[PDB]
């Protein structure tokens, strides 16, 4: 979609741009924990292979 | 004292013998013998062991005054996870018929309470009671995928409490069970996630996700991911 009146477009504007970040912050946080539950697993796979 | 095999034999069979008696079962609800006795059963594997614990299991599960203390025996059984226990002892073949009969009446007794606790009842009492310690209704799918609507009771009341929990609990075991009850409400009902942005829980789960504790940081990531989602 896309606004009809400059106000809605910055409404908008703001709106995505505050979800783009949480989005980024959330996709960090996720990638580190894979990263860390990966490494948890790797220290010990060959044992439980 | 963890003594040996034919002492623990017979220990468990005074228990179960002590357990026909409703009034000892009542009784001996003090002592919580149920926590040891799963633990000797995991950690044994003797068929005498294995059949006594079960027959006892089945004399507490029965012989019960009171329904109060069955469900209270059942709940005992389920957060020291006799039940996956149970379900592999009946994956397991055995050969008298009195274990598998024992084993199927107390699959079948667990499966009744946990029906009992997942009851949406046991939710809204223990939102209000504040008990958020991980009981079976905060995990069961079949619960919140069919009664997550119900948190919108009361005018949002159920989601106000989880929000106020969130915010002002600061206990890692009641912060993360407050976190985990949101994801859970936010994937069994997408159109809960607007009243949860309006309500601010977003915001308090975002900052949650970064917590002292990493049991209540797992949790606020889940319910992060579950909110982000969708658009």
Known sequence: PCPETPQER????????????????????????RQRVLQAAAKNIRVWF | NKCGFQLQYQMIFSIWLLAFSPQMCEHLRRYNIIPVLSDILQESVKEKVTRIILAAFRNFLEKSTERETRQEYALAMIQCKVLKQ????????????????????????LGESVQDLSSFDEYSSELKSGRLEWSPVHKSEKFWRENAVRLNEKNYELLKILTKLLEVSDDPQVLAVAAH??????????????????????????????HEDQQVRYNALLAVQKLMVHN
């Open chain 1, 10 to 33: 910055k409404e908008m504007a703001s709106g995505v741009n505050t979800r783009i970040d949480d989005l980024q912050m959330v996709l960090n946080q996720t990638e580190d924990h």
């Open chain 2, 181 to 210: 009850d949101v994801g859970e409400y936010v994937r069994h009902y997408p159109r809960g996630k607007r009243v949860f942005e309006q309500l601010g829980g977003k915001q308090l789960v975002m900052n949650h996700m970064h």
């Open chain 2, 86 to 109: 149970l379900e592999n002892l009946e994956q397991q073949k055995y050969d008298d018929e009195d274990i598998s009969e024992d084993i199927k009446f107390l699959l079948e007794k």
